[PDB]
Design a protein. Structure first.
Ligand SMILES: Nc1nc2c(c(=O)[nH]1)N[C@H]1C(S)=C(S)[C@@H](COP(=O)(O)OP(=O)(O)OC[C@H]3O[C@@H](n4cnc5c(=O)[nH]c(N)nc54)[C@H](O)[C@@H]3O)O[C@H]1N2
Ligand SMILES: Nc1nc2c(c(=O)[nH]1)N[C@H]1C(S)=C(S)[C@@H](COP(=O)(O)OP(=O)(O)OC[C@H]3O[C@@H](n4cnc5c(=O)[nH]c(N)nc54)[C@H](O)[C@@H]3O)O[C@H]1N2
Ligand code: SF4
Ligand code: SF4
Ligand code: SF4
Ligand code: SF4
Ligand code: F3S
Ligand SMILES: [Mo]
Lengths: 1218, 465
């Protein structure tokens, strides 16, 4: 009847607009945004993606429950509508302004007054926000920036924003402003611990993985520490559907996770011990498919694509030998006929016993052309050769080599197997007379590997296995004791996996994630899985390989976006910084370090050469140009040029001289001296101070200068030993940040602790672009409605700040000269820095040579009053120098000519005649036109540049797509697939899906490693001395965070120490959506923690009881979720719950309960600090220390008093435990 | 004899990942209103569990569905006509708010307006959407048991664990969990229609969609008790009841329901089914509970039979609807391959939203075992999910139809692996389950590739008439 028209009317709408989500999920899903009466009402997925091959499932509809709830945010009660400022700060700002008409002077009068400063800094996170205006906040922000740059330096200003792929222009907005003024741009991939150091170590690549549709081409898949249905939702169907094609799937998780539901088998190893299982599996694979019944496919594969045939020099020790660095052409007489970089070319024996320097080692990459390829050819004669794998059978003798074993150094919480700290093995060796006349013994990476796995080969090695049941280093029986997983399961799966790979030539795949990558020894977890895939020739074959998925790390049109984001079109270089080191330093988490480098060393290392605090290793790496610094120098870099002049020297020589004598020092040596810490911080597209940042309480104490919940004592208080490179103070400097500016659309935890909050446009109110690792489409974010209330897009917000800055700086900053340090970069000729060992110029072991034994020292001219005009225009450097990345470069004049027609040009001023960058769409068109993956004309030029290096034609990969040009307005009509480009190793082809390593294997392009092949052996001095030259099991570390505080503040209830894991949640993407009512209603209405039934019973905890979790780092409050699916001994607080909703007071700190990162703290690893060594050289987000976190242990107990600390008389009391 | 058409729906639970996207999109479009904020027309429950409202499958408790009188005739379990009208005044079985959950919100504004000099960090506390008062603690939600959240012995009170020796499943190594997304079944013998004396509830003749006339509803609520799936919710603000409307505004235009098109897992299929409306009473009245499944299959007509077509046209079914029925993916799954099964057929409503049971990891053992009938792939007997459990859920306790569905999907996998990995034709598994290569290939086409045009085959309703 007529009443039916009611529901019909509800569905009717005014229009649908296409947009996506700028959140770090990797989803990259296109949606239909419905508008009714000028308001967004709901969204449903777009289904018009270009379809995949008929034999593969299509992508539609993608989507997930979080994204489906985004519309809730637009007019919600938590929406940020106007610029906000802390009341106390606004009061002082206005009083000061009445005294000083110049805002810079105004700011000065405030921040130079200890009492005034302390006044608003202590108000952080304590209410009092007041509505301001754009004009007011823009002037204050600009004045602060000018004051900081002028009195301390450009690099005392910084910005944090991650994952540019989820919203490219939005990321670029702030990064471009900062890069122009010289501020610091902080990294995120390493900081978040999504970067797997094992990737750069093995392939010389940040991360390149198969697309999800490629899982469908696989016939055997293991989901290892990856909760696919929950953390890869829009792609999960490829996994569920491929099972119908006959593909067997295996889930490896300690708990019964959602992924288990989808597999044919569930294996539950003890969390953190996965490397042990991987080792035993590789052991079985080597025994049966390489040794006992040699696989034709596997053998040929490892011979041509790995460093297994490469020779390693043995170091003579007391009674035995230690594996040293890899033999180089320069070690032999006449350097094997290599005049160019002979010290960077590895060596192997051909199948005729002759030595040869094979094509492809990193030495052939620079200084010459045409031999940097994986053709099996003699690098001297050019003739084809066949490399020899094993020396067994042609050895001159047998040596006993020592291998480090840590499988017995576990903590009391994990099972261990005692053997010997050093295991001696029988190795076939050859005697060589080096160029200096001396003799050396060598062996291949191949037998060192077989030895390390404990495989008996006909010698009488007592440390090798006589059976899989023999408890020896890395046998199933050994792994069974360490992991708890049945030895027969380990054996059966290793066989099926390898057998499947042999029958299909590599179509076996391992999907892995943060479950394994967030452990301190993520390096070993990954190298374990990687070795299995390599032994089976899976890497580089469609349907096979290393499928690492974490955040939305892959911004496909990389070289088009880089120049925009870091203003490389106007000035080079910018100031990049690796965040883990940055925060370990400035939030002073190093002052509480409990882990020593000494306990990480290989038993065969010279302890005396590795003394000092972990932070000393970082400072040393920085001075050697291995890692970046921020702030860089202990003096304002804008004042160095004027002194070099007074001293009749050029800026660079003056700086090098000063560093040598000590008149100028690296700021990292004296971090608390009052001039070497960041003072201004911009935060956007991030909830750092409230969820991302590990060591939450330390950040509150040292960065913000506010109340905190740290429970333990620092270094001085425990009589511990201090740093040898950094000064020490019993009372660390607190409240370092003078101003914290956060841009968001919802009032997050970070916002709650900022000084100024800027309202930004939601994803449905602005234009931008988005790409992902999961699929090959680039699509847009669009404005279905104009920004609500007083919100503005990130691009417009930073543009306005830039415009105001250009005005406020006049008279304070003009055309300045800046001295910028730049670490030795991977993918640059300088990557061939220190070939044979490590020398520290500061220790007088070599001279300070910029770009080789020290960072590069660069001169950058900055026209401060022209900041806005440069921001809003594409610079002349693209036409003068060119564009490029990943080691190649090309001319891009044709793209600039086109951009002048699409964006129009400046009619006057400093950038007269340059293409304009007024709108977000102008910036998007710049990215699309410049990138090889979106402009076929550039793709061909890029492939041609690479062809010069390899000597092989690669242009055929993009020639058939030359002429294709992706335009912003076209992707609004339909998402488009990108173009095959040299920036990536997978292909965009009609017949084969995108599979990483495909071009290396099929086009014979070398991996960017020392040997040019997949690097199984790491020969850098530090890798060797820290025991990681080869894969070895390393148990979870002891953070020593419980012992000192357990039982110290009893509340009467039973306490217990448990392993604190933080896998990503089902009701949000990180903290985004965490405050969204739809997600809160489908979850449990706020912060909760999962506990096994056993542990819960022991603690007298019932489902949903209020509990407290803490350790020396801090404390958090939450409700419990008691479940059978959680194994005893571990607790899970799904990552992303924040500090703004449903949290009562803490009984441990008497403050608002903390977050999951209140109980964690940064602890770096020296091997992640290595630089100046081919594949181990710096790159923004490419290498650097990571924010590992799964090793953490905490104290858990039922809460007693539930106080909300809010003033109402609504507090509760939970009945005792008894 | 009266031929009717209805768009049936099949959810492949083997592919469900329990994401709840389906629940969010339905909520956004149809129930984001005061009065039904607590109602989820489409909701997903993790099993083992008691669900939403709590223990809804317990008819002895809620009195839903039909019962068969000793005289062979059907009567609502909640009473005859007389008793029903009496329950307009007193109905002691209605689901209480605690059986669902007290809907809540949070004081987000406190984060914005917290005054200067606050003694602690401002926080957003919960507040009831019903009373508007502060809530000291959230104790319930519509999805509280998600992913086995709660002590097992409490979750195990699941009605489907009836007649099953539970003990062993209360052990870590034997853990199992599945997801049950569900909406209104738009039944052929709706108990809701029979429990509302005024006739405010009706099943549309053109498409079988069951709706509650908002003008006619008086809030008597016997229908809430009557529906054994508890899919009718009281709108406390309007004083009327509401339920899933099968997105008729979209179905009438030849589009999928919102929850089907937005299903991230691509597990939902929509297709036309023709049936003899005059054969429903007899089928729902069959004596043995375990015959209800087959009796319902018997009312579905063959859209390709010339007489059926002829009769359909005479009864007013547009030719385009009949042609859609001939391409129905739902017919193939329910009638031909026998993969889809009804949800609780014993309630006697002849539900129209069917389910394909899920496969699961093999049972835990430690003894890695050896190859089986299906090689490295599982054999139906080794699946960790107790088949009796799936039987109580989908076939009134009869494991035979469930084992057949599961066994047929496994056979497809075995056949396809031989083809794609060994490059050979092996039909042993197919022969063992009564399927031909042609069938296995079409199953693969619809279940694995699942192109959009194959998942939804919905004809428009010819509104010009
Ligand atoms: N819904 C949703 N999806 C997300 C995100 C989100 O916040 N929400 N985050 C995205 C981002 S940025 C990232 S980096 C990824 C991370 O997501 P994943 O790569 O899935 O990482 P984890 O969540 O740690 O997943 C590890 C899984 O393995 C198990 N596990 C835990 N510890 C171990 C261990 O030591 N060994 C083994 N074998 N298993 C273990 C757990 O059951 C857990 O579910 O998620 C992405 N997807
Ligand atoms: N203990 C522990 N810590 C972890 C992890 C873990 O597993 N364990 N996971 C780590 C990992 S892998 C990651 S990826 C990080 C993620 O950490 P974050 O990057 O902090 O993640 P979100 O919480 O999503 O923060 C994004 C913020 O951006 C805002 N936002 C969204 N879009 C826009 C936009 O267009 N403009 C602006 N101006 N703001 C916007 C949102 O409202 C939100 O508050 O957390 C890391 N920290
Ligand atoms: S949040 Fe990410 S995964 Fe979810 S719908 Fe949005 S883009 Fe897709
Ligand atoms: S959207 Fe689809 S896969 Fe996700 S829970 Fe609902 S029915 Fe299952
Ligand atoms: S499931 Fe729907 S049609 Fe069937 S009885 Fe319940 S409300 Fe009525
Ligand atoms: S068919 Fe429509 S009304 Fe019914 S549950 Fe699905 S989306 Fe909601
Ligand atoms: S019994 Fe009838 S009166 Fe309304 S509440 Fe149910 S449709
Ligand atoms: Mo991440």
């Amino acid at each position: 009847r007529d009443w039916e028209d009611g529901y019909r009317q509800r569905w009717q709408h005014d229009k649908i607009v296409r947009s996506t989500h700028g959140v770090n999920c990797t989803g990259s899903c296109s949606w239909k945004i419905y508008v009714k009466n000028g308001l967004v009402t709901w969204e449903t997925q777009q289904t018009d993606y270009p379809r995949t091959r008929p034999d593969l499932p299509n992508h539609e509809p993608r989507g997930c429950p979080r994204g489906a709830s985004y519309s809730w945010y637009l007019y919600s009660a938590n929406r940020l509508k106007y610029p906000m400022m802390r009341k106390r700060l606004m009061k002082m700002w206005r009083e000061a302004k009445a005294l000083h008409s110049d805002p810079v002077e105004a700011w000065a009068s405030i921040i130079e007054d200890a009492d005034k400063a302390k006044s608003f800094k202590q108000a952080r996170g304590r209410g009092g926000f007041v509505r301001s205006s754009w004009q007011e906040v823009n002037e204050l922000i600009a004045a602060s920036n000018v004051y900081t740059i002028k009195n301390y330096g450009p690099d005392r200003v910084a910005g944090f924003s991650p994952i540019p792929a989820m919203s490219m222009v939005s990321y670029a907005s702030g990064a471009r402003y900062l890069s122009l003024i010289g501020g610091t741009c902080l990294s995120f991939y390493d900081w978040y611990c999504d970067l797997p150091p094992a990737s750069p170590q093995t392939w010389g690549e940040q991360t390149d993985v198969p697309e999800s549709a490629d899982w469908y081409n696989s016939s055997y898949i293991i989901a290892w520490g990856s909760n696919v249905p929950q953390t890869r939702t829009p792609d999960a169907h490829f996994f569920t559907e491929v099972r119908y094609k006959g593909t067997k799937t295996v889930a490896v998780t300690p708990d019964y996770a959602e992924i288990a539901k989808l597999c044919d088998l569930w294996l539950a190893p003890k969390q953190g011990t996965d490397a042990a299982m991987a080792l035993a599996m590789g052991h079985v694979m080597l025994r049966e498919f390489h040794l006992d019944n040699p696989s034709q496919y596997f053998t040929d594969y490892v011979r041509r694509y790995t460093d297994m045939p490469m020779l390693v020099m043995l170091e003579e020790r007391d009674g035995y030998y230690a594996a040293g660095r890899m033999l180089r052409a320069a070690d032999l007489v006449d350097a094997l006929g290599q005049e160019n970089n002979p010290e960077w070319k590895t060596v192997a024996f051909n199948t005729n016993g002759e030595m040869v320097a094979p094509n492809g080692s990193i030495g052939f990459r620079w200084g010459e052309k045409g031999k940097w390829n994986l053709e099996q050819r003699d690098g001297k004669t050019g003739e084809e050769t066949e490399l020899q794998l094993s020396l067994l059978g042609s050895q001159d003798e047998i040596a006993e080599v020592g291998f480090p074993y840590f499988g017995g150094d576990g903590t009391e919480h994990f099972n261990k197997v005692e053997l010997e700290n050093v295991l001696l093995h029988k190795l076939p060796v050859k005697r060589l007379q080096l160029a200096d006349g001396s003799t050396a013994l060598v062996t291949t990476v191949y037998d060192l590997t077989l030895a390390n796995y404990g495989l008996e080969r006909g010698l009488n090695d007592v440390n090798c296995a006589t059976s899989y049941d023999d408890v020896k280093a890395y046998t199933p029986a050994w792994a069974e004791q360490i992991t708890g997983v049945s030895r027969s399961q380990i054996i059966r799966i290793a066989r099926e996996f390898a057998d499947n790979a042999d029958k299909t030539h590599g179509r076996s795949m391992i999907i892995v994630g943060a479950g394994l990558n967030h452990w301190y020894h993520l390096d070993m977890n990954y190298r374990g899985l990687i070795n299995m895939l390599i032994f089976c020739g899976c890497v580089g074959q469609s349907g096979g390989g290393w499928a690492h998925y974490v955040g939305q790390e892959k911004l496909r049109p990389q070289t088009g976006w880089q120049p925009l984001a870091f203003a490389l079109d106007w000035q080079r270089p910018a100031r990049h910084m690796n965040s883990t080191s940055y925060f370990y330093n400035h939030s002073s988490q190093w002052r509480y370090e409990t882990v020593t480098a000494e306990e990480l060393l290989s038993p065969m290392a010279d302890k005396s050469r590795y003394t000092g605090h972990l932070i000393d290793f970082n400072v040393r790496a920085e001075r050697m140009g291995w890692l970046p610094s921020a702030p860089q120098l202990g003096t304002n870099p804008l004042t160095i040029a004027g002194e070099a002049e007074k001293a009749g020297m050029n800026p660079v020589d003056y700086t090098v001289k000063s560093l040598k004598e000590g008149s100028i020092r690296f700021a990292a040596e004296q971090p608390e001296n009052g001039k070497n810490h960041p003072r201004n911080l911009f935060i956007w597209r991030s909830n750092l101070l409230g969820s991302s940042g590990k060591g939450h309480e330390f950040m509150l104490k040292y960065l913000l200068g506010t109340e905190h919940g740290i429970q333990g004592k620092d270094l001085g208080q425990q009589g511990g030993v201090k740093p040898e490179e950094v000064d020490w103070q019993d009372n660390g400097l607190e409240g370092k940040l003078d101003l914290v500016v956060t841009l968001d659309f919802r009032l997050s935890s970070t916002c709650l602790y900022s000084d100024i909050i800027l309202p930004t446009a939601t994803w449905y109110e602005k234009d931008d672009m988005n790409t992902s690792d999961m699929h090959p489409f680039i699509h847009p974010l669009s404005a279905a409605v104009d920004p609500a209330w007083e919100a503005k897009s990130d691009w417009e917000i930073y543009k306005a700040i830039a415009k105001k800055f250009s005005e406020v700086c006049v008279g304070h900053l003009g055309k300045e000269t800046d001295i910028v340090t730049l670490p030795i970069q991977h993918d640059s000729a300088a990557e061939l820095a220190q070939p044979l060992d490590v020398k520290d110029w500061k220790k007088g072991e070599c001279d300070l040579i910029p770009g080789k034994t020290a960072p590069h020292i660069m001169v950058v001219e900055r026209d401060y009053p022209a900041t806005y005009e440069r921001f809003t225009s594409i610079g002349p450097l693209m036409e003068k120098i060119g564009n490029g990345g990943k080691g190649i470069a090309w001319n891009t004049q044709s793209e600039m000519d086109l951009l002048r027609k699409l964006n129009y040009t400046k009619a006057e001023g400093p950038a007269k005649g340059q293409p304009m960058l007024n709108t977000a769409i102008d910036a998007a068109e710049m990215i699309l036109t410049l990138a090889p993956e979106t402009n076929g004309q550039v793709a061909v030029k890029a492939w041609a540049a690479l062809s010069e290096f390899t000597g092989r034609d690669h242009t055929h990969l993009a020639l058939n797509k030359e002429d294709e040009k992706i335009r912003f307005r076209d992707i609004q009509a339909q998402p488009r697939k990108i173009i095959s480009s040299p920036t990536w190793s997978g292909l965009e082809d009609e017949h084969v899906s995108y599979n990483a390593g495909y071009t290396n294997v099929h086009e014979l392009i070398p991996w960017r490693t020392l040997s040019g092949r997949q690097q199984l052996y790491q020969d850098h001095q530090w890798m060797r001395d820290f025991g990681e030259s080869l894969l070895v099991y390393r148990p979870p570390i002891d953070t020593r965070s419980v012992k000192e505080v357990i039982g110290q503040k009893s509340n009467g209830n039973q306490e217990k120490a448990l392993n604190f894991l933080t896998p990503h949640q089902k009701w949000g993407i990180h903290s985004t959506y965490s405050d969204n009512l739809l997600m809160l209603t489908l979850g449990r209405g706020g912060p909760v923690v999962w506990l096994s039934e056993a542990d819960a019973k022991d603690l007298g905890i019932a489902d949903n009881d209020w509990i407290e979790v803490f350790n020396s780092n801090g404390a958090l409050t939450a409700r419990a979720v008691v479940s059978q699916r959680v194994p005893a001994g571990m607790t899970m607080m799904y990552h992303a719950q924040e500090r703004i909703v449903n949290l009562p007071g803490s009984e441990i700190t008497q403050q608002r309960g903390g977050i999951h990162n209140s109980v964690t703290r940064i602890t770096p690893k020296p091997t992640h600090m290595i630089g100046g060594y081919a594949h181990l050289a710096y790159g923004f987000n490419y290498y650097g220390t990571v924010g590992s976190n799964r090793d953490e242990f905490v104290v858990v107990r039922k809460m007693k008093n539930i106080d909300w600390l809010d003033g109402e008389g609504n507090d509760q009391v939970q009945e005792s435990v008894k | 004899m009266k031929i009717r058409s209805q768009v049936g729906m099949v959810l492949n639970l083997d592919k469900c990942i329990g994401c709840h996207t389906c629940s969010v999109t339905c909520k956004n479009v149809w129930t984001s209103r005061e009065g039904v904020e607590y109602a989820w027309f489409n909701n997903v429950e993790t099993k083992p569990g008691q669900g939403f409202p709590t223990d809804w499958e317990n008819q002895e408790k809620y009195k839903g569905g039909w019962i068969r009188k000793i005289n062979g005739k059907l009567q609502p379990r909640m009473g005859n006509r007389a008793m029903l009208l009496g329950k307009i005044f007193a109905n002691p079985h209605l689901p209480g708010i605690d059986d669902y959950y007290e809907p809540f919100d949070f004081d987000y504004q406190n984060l914005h307006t917290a005054p200067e000099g606050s003694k602690s960090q401002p926080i957003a506390r919960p507040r009831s959407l019903i009373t508007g008062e502060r809530m000291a603690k959230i104790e319930k939600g519509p999805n509280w048991e998600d992913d086995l959240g709660g002590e097992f012995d409490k979750l195990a009170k699941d009605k489907n664990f009836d007649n099953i020796q539970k003990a062993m499943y209360s052990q870590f190594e034997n853990t199992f969990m599945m997801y049950l997304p569900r909406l209104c079944e738009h039944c052929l013998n709706p108990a809701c229609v029979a429990t509302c004396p005024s006739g405010a509830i009706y099943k549309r003749e053109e498409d079988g969609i069951v709706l509650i006339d908002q003008d006619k509803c008086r809030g008597w609520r016997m229908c809430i008790t009557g529906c054994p799936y508890k899919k009718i919710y009281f709108n406390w603000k309007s004083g009327k009841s509401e339920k899933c409307i099968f997105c008729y505004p979209r179905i009438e235009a030849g589009q999928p329901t919102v929850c089907s098109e937005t299903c991230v897992g691509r597990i939902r299929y929509l297709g036309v089914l023709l049936y003899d409306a005059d054969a429903i009473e007899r089928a729902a009245s069959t004596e043995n509970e375990k015959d209800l499944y087959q009796r319902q299959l018997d009312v579905f007509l063959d859209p390709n039979d010339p007489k059926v077509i002829e009769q359909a046209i005479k009864d007013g079914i547009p030719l385009s609807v009949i042609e859609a029925a001939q391409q129905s993916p739902v017919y193939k799954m329910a009638m031909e391959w026998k993969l889809a099964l009804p949800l609780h057929p014993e309630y006697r409503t002849l539900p129209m939203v069917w389910y394909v049971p899920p496969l699961s990891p093999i049972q835990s053992a430690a003894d890695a075992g050896e190859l089986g009938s299906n090689g490295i792939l599982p054999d139906v007997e080794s699946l960790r999910i107790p088949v009796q459990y799936l039987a109580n859920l989908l076939t009134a306790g009869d494991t035979k139809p469930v084992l057949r569905a599961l066994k047929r999907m496994l056979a497809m996998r075995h056949y396809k692996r031989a083809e794609t990995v060994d490059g050979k034709v092996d039909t042993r598994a197919l022969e063992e389950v009564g399927l031909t290569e042609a069938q296995a290939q079409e199953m693969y086409r619809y279940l694995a590739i699942a192109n959009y045009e194959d998942r939804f085959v919905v004809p428009s309703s010819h509104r010009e008439l």
